[PDB]
Amino acid sequence: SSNITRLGWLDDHYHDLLTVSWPVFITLITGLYLVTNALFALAYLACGDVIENARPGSFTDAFFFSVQTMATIGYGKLIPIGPLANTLVTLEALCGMLGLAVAASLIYARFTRPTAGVLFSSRMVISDFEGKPTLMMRLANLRIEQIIEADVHLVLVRSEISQEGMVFRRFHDLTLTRSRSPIFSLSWTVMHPIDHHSPIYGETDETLRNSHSEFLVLFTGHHEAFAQNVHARHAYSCDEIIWGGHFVDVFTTLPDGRRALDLGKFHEIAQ
């Protein structure tokens, strides 16, 4: 979240249509729908009394005729009369379907958006693994389907002072022992070894709070479920780092002797 005030209507039409809330989107469409039919109705009246069984010079009748015509229900009470009437008809028809074509695309465009079934460990931990302190957290796939060429970024964000004494926010991508997982299917524990190259080297808790430093995780991959790309983002604050902690294991052997995953343990950190 980046709240702020941007100083600077139809400009971004396509974005806006995909960005709007479903209620609003439907409204807009509806509005457009009603509107255009009214317009068409007027076109009809404009010709004057060109529709069978229509109360003379009545907009309602014309309007409803226009819908029956444009939605192509074509009930059959109200009917065109004469060249002008019908031309407007064959024009509306086309208009109607084009509208459908445009509506569909929008619908589909906004409708077809997957979500990685990915869950983030509520905490990070800093603990010794393979002889160097390692910052870690872990992802669990929440669905049976697999994610291919999945990969993750662990980014430290913190404030720094320039020689000139500008106090700004700067981003550090943190080298992970494993950044790609071509086949992510159950759980993945991501690790950033801390050594003389880690921007968090020889850093205590006190020092982390002091730079007002947070940790941002971006996960992305190709989800087999949707046959489409997915991603998920999470953020941690200095205080969600459990120093010395170790993620419990979620891997079990059943009585049956069959391996298992207990995602109840997923958020549990031994200490």
Residues 172-191 that bind a second copy (CB under 8 A): 173, 178, 180-183, 185-186
Which of 48, 83, 202, 244: binder of a second copy (CB under 8 A)? 83
**Tokens 């409204």 belong to residue:** 27
State the nearest-atom distance from the C-beta of 56 to a second copy, in Å: 17
- Token pair, residue 220, equals 């992305």
Segment 8 to 37, residues that bind a second copy, using CB under 8 A:
8, 12, 14-15, 18-19, 26, 29-30, 33, 37
Question: Can you tell me whether residue 144 is helix, strand or coil?
Answer: coil
Under rule CB under 8 A, residue 60 binds a second copy: yes
Q: Which 188-217 residues touch a second copy, going by CB under 8 A?
A: 216
Question: Which residues face 119 on adjacent strands?
Answer: 140
If one asks whether residue 4 binds a second copy (CB under 8 A), the answer comes out as: yes
Binding partner at 245 among K ion, a second copy, none, C-beta below 5 to 8 Å by kind: none
- Assess 55 for contact with a second copy (CB under 8 A): no
- Closest approach of a second copy to the CB of residue 198, in Å: 17
Q: How far apart are CA 144 and CA 260, in angstroms?
A: 13
User: Can you tell me the distance from the alpha carbon of 139 to that of 133, in angstroms, rounded to the nearest whole number?
Assistant: 20
Helix (H) or strand (E) holding 111: helix 82-111
Which of K ion, a second copy, none does residue 196 bind to, with CB < 5 to 8 Å depending on kind? Answer: none
β-bridge mates for residue 184, sequence order = 147
Residue 129 touches which of a second copy, K ion, none (Cβ within 5-8 Å per kind): a second copy
Helix (H, G, I), strand (E, B) or coil at 219: strand
Exposed e or buried b for every residue in 89-120, given b needs 16+ CB within 10 A?
A: beebeebbeebeeeeeebeeeeeeeeebbbbb
If one asks whether residue 72 binds K ion (CB under 5 A), the answer comes out as yes
Given the rule CB under 5 A, which residues bind K ion?
72, 74, 76
